[PDB]
Amino acid sequence: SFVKDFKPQALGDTNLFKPIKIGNNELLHRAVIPPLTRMRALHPGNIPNRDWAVEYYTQRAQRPGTMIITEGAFISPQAGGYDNAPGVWSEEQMVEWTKIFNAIHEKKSFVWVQLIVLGWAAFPDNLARDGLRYDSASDNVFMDAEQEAKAKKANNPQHSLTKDEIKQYIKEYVQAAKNSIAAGADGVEIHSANGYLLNQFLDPHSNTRTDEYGGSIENRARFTLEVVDALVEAIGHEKVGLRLSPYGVFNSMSGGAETGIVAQYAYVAGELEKRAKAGKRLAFVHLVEPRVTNPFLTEGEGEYEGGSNDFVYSIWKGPVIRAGNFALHPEVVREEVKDKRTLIGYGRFFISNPDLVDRLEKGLPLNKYDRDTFYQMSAHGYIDYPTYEEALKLGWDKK
Amino acid sequence: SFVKDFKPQALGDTNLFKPIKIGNNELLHRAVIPPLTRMRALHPGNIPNRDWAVEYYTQRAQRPGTMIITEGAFISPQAGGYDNAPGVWSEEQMVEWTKIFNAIHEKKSFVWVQLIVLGWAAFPDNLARDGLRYDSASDNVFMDAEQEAKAKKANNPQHSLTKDEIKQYIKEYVQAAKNSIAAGADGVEIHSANGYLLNQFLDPHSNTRTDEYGGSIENRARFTLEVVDALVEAIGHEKVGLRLSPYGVFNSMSGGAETGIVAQYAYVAGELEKRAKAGKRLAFVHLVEPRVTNPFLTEGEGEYEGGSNDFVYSIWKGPVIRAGNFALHPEVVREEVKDKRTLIGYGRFFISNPDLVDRLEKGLPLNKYDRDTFYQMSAHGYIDYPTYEEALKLGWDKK
Numbered sequence: 001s002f003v004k005d006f007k008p009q010a011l012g013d014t015n016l017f018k019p020i021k022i023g024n025n026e027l028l029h030r031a032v033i034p035p036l037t038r039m040r041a042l043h044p045g046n047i048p049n050r051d052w053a054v055e056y057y058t059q060r061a062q063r064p065g066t067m068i069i070t071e072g073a074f075i076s077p078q079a080g081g082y083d084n085a086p087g088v089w090s091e092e093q094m095v096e097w098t099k100i101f102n103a104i105h106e107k108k109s110f111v112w113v114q115l116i117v118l119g120w121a122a123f124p125d126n127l128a129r130d131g132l133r134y135d136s137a138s139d140n141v142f143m144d145a146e147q148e149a150k151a152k153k154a155n156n157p158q159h160s161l162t163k164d165e166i167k168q169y170i171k172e173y174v175q176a177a178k179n180s181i182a183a184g185a186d187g188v189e190i191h192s193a194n195g196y197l198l199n200q201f202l203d204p205h206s207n208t209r210t211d212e213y214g215g216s217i218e219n220r221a222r223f224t225l226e227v228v229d230a231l232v233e234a235i236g237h238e239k240v241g242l243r244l245s246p247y248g249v250f251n252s253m254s255g256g257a258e259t260g261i262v263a264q265y266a267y268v269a270g271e272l273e274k275r276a277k278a279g280k281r282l283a284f285v286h287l288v289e290p291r292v293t294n295p296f297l298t299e300g301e302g303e304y305e306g307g308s309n310d311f312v313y314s315i316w317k318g319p320v321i322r323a324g325n326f327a328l329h330p331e332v333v334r335e336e337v338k339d340k341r342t343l344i345g346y347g348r349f350f351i352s353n354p355d356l357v358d359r360l361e362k363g364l365p366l367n368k369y370d371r372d373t374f375y376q377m378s379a380h381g382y383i384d385y386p387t388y389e390e391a392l393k394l395g396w397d398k399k
Numbered sequence: 400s401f402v403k404d405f406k407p408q409a410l411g412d413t414n415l416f417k418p419i420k421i422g423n424n425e426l427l428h429r430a431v432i433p434p435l436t437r438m439r440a441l442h443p444g445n446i447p448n449r450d451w452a453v454e455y456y457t458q459r460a461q462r463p464g465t466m467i468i469t470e471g472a473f474i475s476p477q478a479g480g481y482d483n484a485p486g487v488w489s490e491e492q493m494v495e496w497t498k499i500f501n502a503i504h505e506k507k508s509f510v511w512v513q514l515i516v517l518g519w520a521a522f523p524d525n526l527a528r529d530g531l532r533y534d535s536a537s538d539n540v541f542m543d544a545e546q547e548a549k550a551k552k553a554n555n556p557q558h559s560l561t562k563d564e565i566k567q568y569i570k571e572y573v574q575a576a577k578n579s580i581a582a583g584a585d586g587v588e589i590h591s592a593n594g595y596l597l598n599q600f601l602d603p604h605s606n607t608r609t610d611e612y613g614g615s616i617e618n619r620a621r622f623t624l625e626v627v628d629a630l631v632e633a634i635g636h637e638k639v640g641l642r643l644s645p646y647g648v649f650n651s652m653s654g655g656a657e658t659g660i661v662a663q664y665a666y667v668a669g670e671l672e673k674r675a676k677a678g679k680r681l682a683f684v685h686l687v688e689p690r691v692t693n694p695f696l697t698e699g700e701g702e703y704e705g706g707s708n709d710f711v712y713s714i715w716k717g718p719v720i721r722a723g724n725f726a727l728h729p730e731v732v733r734e735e736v737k738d739k740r741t742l743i744g745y746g747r748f749f750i751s752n753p754d755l756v757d758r759l760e761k762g763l764p765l766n767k768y769d770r771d772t773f774y775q776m777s778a779h780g781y782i783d784y785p786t787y788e789e790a791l792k793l794g795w796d797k798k
């Protein structure tokens with residue numbers, strides 16, 4: 001059914017519908033699909049879903065010139081720990097990704113692979129089963145009591161990475177980025193948000209290290225910036241973006257409660273601008289808004305009102321993608337896109353509306369999403385959400 | 400005469416005219432006199448002007464409940480280097496300051512002493528004459544070629560402070576703050592802006608140190624925060640404010656050209672909020688706006704459009720005073736004061752309008768200022784600017 005208490009607004013008269021170039025890609029509008037883990041990849045081997053993934057992405061690529069960022073993809077077995085999220089390290093995986101990229105390109109849209117490394121968000125028992133470590137920045141602070149306990153039970157207690165192990169992850173990021181481009185992707189997004197491994201290094205709660213990778217703003221940003229630099233060198237700055245969530249608390253990050261949090265992220269933004277001024281400007285910075293500090297809370301919940309991402313614009317001078325509770329708030333989007341280098345990521349409502357872009361342009365009702373099928377091994381709630389035309393045929397205008 | 404091309408706006412219907420408490424002081428409105436060096440102090444001894452200073456401050460205290468921040472005052476001979484700026488280290492000086500504070504209090508207004516230390520902005524020949532060093536953070540970068548050359552000619556080449564010498568300055572800050580309070584001041588403002596000594600430490604252009612006082616964000620902020628902590632301990636957090644100019648370029652600071660500049664100031668703001676949450680909240684943070692990156696350029700010149708101070712509000716949660724080209728822009732003030740913890744500093748137009756607050760409330764014409772007498776040894780252009788009533792009697796409505 002359609003969202004009941006929503007008053008749509010046509011956004012066709014705003015910059016949301018002005019073309020913009022991101023990296024090598026000529027976008028025809030500025031509604032971006034942010035990375036959305038859906039858990040349809042198959043075990044063993046973390047293989048993108050052989051039955052449904054092409055169709056899922058094809059549907060959501062339907063508006064020409066749409067930028068799509070993939071669900072997070074593991075750079076290596078050690079980077080993983082969810083059996084039904086995909087990877088980008090193996091031939092088996094890349095065969096499926098190539099089909100997905102080809103399908104998106106046939107719709108005249110674009111695709112950027114998000115590269116993820118779980119750190120303490122991984123399931124330690126899955127990792128133990130596969131003979132893998134349970135990794136984080138530190139070994140004396142944990143995501144939660146359940147994760148700590150699971151790790152101990154699995155004889156796999158949380159491990160603080162050595163410098164050599166950090167370097168090994170960097171090698172895997174590089175190879176994953178190369179794999180992605182070779183298979184046809186337009187670029188990659190480095191995930192440094194949402195409390196995954198890179199964020200675990202950025203955040204002083206999760207990073208209690210006393211070596212060069214912790215203990216100061218510059219040290220906490222070191223790993224993230226090393227990944228940025230390694231990927232820029234490997235595949236070019238025009239094929240690399242970075243995702244950050246300054247005010248996020250998901251996966252036990254600090255958010256605004258940490259008085260030093262803005263400084264930590266301002267430093268990262270500054271270092272990206274320094275690289276840009278030196279001739280290597282990333283394609284984009286992607287920010288999760290304080291509008292959504294935890295994406296598994298219903299829209300309007302977990303909204304942090306004590307901080308703004310606006311500071312990033314004083315520092316980084318390139319494109320900025322912003323995501324978080326924008327679908328239900330066209331009045332906010334109308335104001336944000338007045339800035340000519342701002343794009344808007346729509347997550348949950350792109351799950352439920354394959355034709356979201358048309359709906360945004362024309363001010364149409366939105367399909368309600370079904371949270372129960374966000375992570376299911378099913379075509380249901382994945383590829384069977386209707387377009388607006390299909391919804392009318394189903395009588396949703398009268399439900 | 401009155402400013403010709405100015406269209407005044409009555410601001411009485413805005414928060415500019417709502418009372419607010421700053422430290423121990425119940426302000427009746429939010430128009431603040433920022434620190435304004437006027438060079439009427441007499442040599443020898445850096446003595447506040449025995450003839451005119453009481454009258455100058457009395458005039459500008461005339462609106463009950465006005466917060467006045469004094470012209471910068473040297474904490475010690477070594478902190479100085481301008482013969483006609485006042486100090487707060489000697490009995491002779493404090494005798495005059497006491498008269499000034501008493502006069503301001505008789506008008507039911509308030510007075511905060513700005514404490515300044517010049518560093519590389521000092522005149523090295525004055526310092527040499529008096530047997531004093533020419534100090535800065537570093538010894539291999541200079542304010543400009545003329546200052547470097549003057550220092551060498553005076554056999555007083557710029558000196559990078561030792562840790563012991565930093566500690567000595569801290570002792571002098573503490574004693575200067577004590578002197579100020581004992582003489583009747585309501586509080587002190589620590590000047591860490593405008594390219595003076597503390598700013599010389601904050602800024603990576605002027606601070607090339609490799610010890611604990613340079614080489615990182617935390618290290619560059621160390622001296623400023625040590626002064627904050629020493630003064631909070633000595634006279635209490637409710638009697639201490641801090642002035643910063645993140646985007647300033649005056650006295651050869653970096654401004655927005657330094658990609659790390661926002662992070663540097665965000666760190667300072669975060670450290671103040673951390674102290675506040677731990678029970679020691681400074682009375683205020685005072686920011687110079689990017690509207691004025693150099694206060695000796697005419698209003699509208701040297702305006703940096705690539706940055707905003709708004710980031711500070713995401714971090715520091717106490718009162719914020721903002722200064723820079725606000726007198727000629729009531730339309731901007733009207734928007735800024737919608738934030739309920741924002742005060743507005745009016746500098747140059749408080750020089751020329753002793754009754755500025757009345758003029759702001761009622762939307763009256765403003766007296767033009769005379770830049771030639773900003774730094775003169777004269778009552779002219781100091782205490783002879785008329786109130787609005789006096790200006791009408793002089794026929795300024797018809798000039």
Ligand SMILES: Cc1cc2nc3c(=O)[nH]c(=O)nc-3n(C[C@H](O)[C@H](O)[C@H](O)COP(=O)(O)O)c2cc1C
Pocket residue numbers: 034035036037038070071072114191193194243288292295296323324325326327345346347348349374375
């Ligand atoms: C089911 C689901 C899966 C997500 N997967 C990812 C992911 O793989 N990587 C990532 O960076 N963010 C992920 N997110 C966060 C979203 O990209 C987005 O920032 C968030 O949902 C807020 O935007 P929205 O209000 O438009 O949904 C996910 C969110 C949801 C609800």
Ligand SMILES: Cc1cc2nc3c(=O)[nH]c(=O)nc-3n(C[C@H](O)[C@H](O)[C@H](O)COP(=O)(O)O)c2cc1C
Pocket residue numbers: 433434435436437469470471513590592593642687691694695722723724725726744745746747748773774
């Ligand atoms: C003549 C003059 C003297 C000043 N003296 C000081 C000073 O002693 N300390 C300080 O922090 N700022 C000083 N400033 C900067 C002002 O406080 C203020 O930030 C600046 O003039 C911008 O505000 P405005 O546009 O309202 O004048 C001075 C400015 C002027 C023009």
Ligand SMILES: O=C1CCC=C1CO
Pocket residue numbers: 037072085116193194295
């Ligand atoms: O980043 C996020 C938010 C929810 C899932 C991921 C990656 O697996």
Ligand SMILES: O=C1CCC=C1CO
Pocket residue numbers: 436471484515592593694
């Ligand atoms: O801070 C400033 C700006 C002009 C003079 C000072 C202090 O002497």
Ligand SMILES: [Mg+2]
Pocket residue numbers: 139157158159
């Ligand atoms: Mg151990």
Ligand SMILES: [Mg+2]
Pocket residue numbers: 372
């Ligand atoms: Mg169901």
Ligand SMILES: [Mg+2]
Pocket residue numbers: 538556557558
């Ligand atoms: Mg020397």
Ligand SMILES: [Mg+2]
Pocket residue numbers: 771
């Ligand atoms: Mg003259």
